[PDB]
Amino acid sequence: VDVLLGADDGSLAFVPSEFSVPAGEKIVFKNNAGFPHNVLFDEDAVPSGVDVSKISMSEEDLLNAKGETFEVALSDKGEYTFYCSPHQGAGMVGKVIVN
Template sequence: MKATLRAPASRASAVRPVASLKAAAQRVASVAGVSVASLALTLAAHADATVKLGADSGALEFVPKTLTIKSGETVNFVNNAGFPHNIVFDEDAIPSGVNADAISRDDYLNAPGETYSVKLTAAGEYGYYCEPHQGAGMVGKIIVQ
């Protein structure tokens, strides 16, 4: 006796996606403990350079401590350790004519993964610090070429 195999009536009925990409992303994000919204914001954010607020070891420092970028590039500061940190540019340690208040982030980044981005255009050196941890040596420098 011969078996006969029949193809489905239409390809559309034979091949259906199990779940949408959005649903798959939601499942992955929920397993990872992050919301789809924060995942999307993280993926959408563009930075030319990243500075960690707190070392992987837990030390109170910016990593890297000194960073060199080109004019017009964006620096993304990421809270790495979960301590409250901020980014305050020292008005006496930035190029003349740059408004330190406009580029600083006085509010604290409290949770790991929280970010602050700043685009720097004026060439020169930018000294900055974390206000609550400056005494512990949490200071950094960005050199804009």
């Protein structure tokens, strides 16, 4: 599943912001507009057993160009919150449900 970083109108959103996926399906975060963006998972809002460092960019690493991707595959079922580090305080957060 593809998830855009930034809407075509400049909004600071993941697109889609919430979606469900089967366990192990690859999620392709694709840089879109309104840079910079990145993707990290919230250690406080993932299923128990999940290590967010394995599925997160380094906070220092930013995507500044259209078409750069960050790809992950989540194997543990449950709810995960992801966020954009620069844009977390502007509400660029999302939730994926792995089922």
